A paper describes a structure:
Jasmonates are phytohormones that are pivotal in mediating plant responses to various biotic and abiotic stresses and regulating plant growth. The first crystal structure of OPR3 from tomato (SlOPR3) showed that the enzyme crystallized as a self-inhibitory dimer in which the L6 loop, a critical loop involved in substrate recognition and coenzyme binding, from each protomer intrudes into the active site cavity of the other protomer. Based on these observations, it was postulated that the formation of the self-inhibitory homodimer represents a mechanism for regulating OPR3 activity and, thereby, jasmonic acid biosynthesis.
Author numbering: 10 to 283, 298 to 384, 396
Write the structure that this text describes.
Amino acid sequence: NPLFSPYKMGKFNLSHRVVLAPMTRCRALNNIPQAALGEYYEQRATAGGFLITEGTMISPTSAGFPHVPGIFTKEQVREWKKIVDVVHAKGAVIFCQLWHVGRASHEVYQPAGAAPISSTEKPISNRWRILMPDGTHGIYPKPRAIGTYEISQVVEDYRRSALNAIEAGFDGIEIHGAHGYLIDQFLKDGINDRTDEYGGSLANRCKFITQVVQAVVSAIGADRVGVRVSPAIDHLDAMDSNPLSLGLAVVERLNKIQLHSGSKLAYLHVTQPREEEEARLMRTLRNAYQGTFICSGGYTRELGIEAVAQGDADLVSYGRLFISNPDLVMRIKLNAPLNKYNRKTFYTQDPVVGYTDYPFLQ
Ligand SMILES: Cc1cc2nc3c(=O)[nH]c(=O)nc-3n(C[C@H](O)[C@H](O)[C@H](O)COP(=O)(O)O)c2cc1C
């Protein structure tokens, strides 16, 4: 089984290729990590296994979901440390995903009911709806288009949160630059309509992600930074006219950051729009990137084995199957049946129901 051949992810010696994909679960009440997160991540921790946390707030303006954790406060750092400890107690490697939603928010999630921030003043269309704190679905508002100074301050929020994650004991961080959120709102020419140095050309559209990644690299070292992108996923009206060139332009700047800093990133992480043409886009981005590649999106045990065996990826991250199967790594090793996941409790607040009560194998 190629999923269980060991892999050297830079400085981290992983024992298998099964990764916990980052998943927002909304149990971090009041943006503070709760003990429930500790039990949840510990249930899925394995010796030499790689975990990525739910999207974590870098700022008071970075949320678009309820009860999502942050790492911009000393209290959040203090509470994240107890979770990192129980995870490292089982020998797992864990990264904190740094998440800013951009325009994918609502006044209910913003301090003083302010408008969310974005590259543009264009809102998400009402084809998409935002989960409200009360379980209803609300309307995405008009965002505020920020100047270049405010762009540099957001880069600083990424930089400070990366240092906070290291203080909490995380082995590294993942930059969430996918799924139509803040960074992707700069990348995709379907969203980025700016006429300054952050809009227009493909080079200008990649400036924001380059500056974010360079800032966390120089802060904690390239070998502790992962980067997640999704060029071909139109989530939240996040289309690009040339998804492959967009992905290749992004990949090239990661390669240059590695050459500049003289060190390789932890990995590049790409979700795919889960047909053969979409598989070719992943392999094209894989072949272009000088380092570790993590593939994600609709993967199974068989597709994951097939990805690693054919060189399509070095690591495979699983989302929904990891919700319902805490011992997904053990089940996949034994080729044991997988349990179904409850969609209704993906984003609920209960610290147990649909979060930690999925049973292990008999
Ligand atoms: C409930 C849920 C929450 C998710 N939260 C995040 C997130 O916070 N950040 C992120 O980059 N991806 C997030 N994802 C996407 C996953 O990281 C991953 O791309 C996806 O689950 C892979 O598809 P799979 O379920 O077939 O494994 C989430 C997915 C689900 C189902």
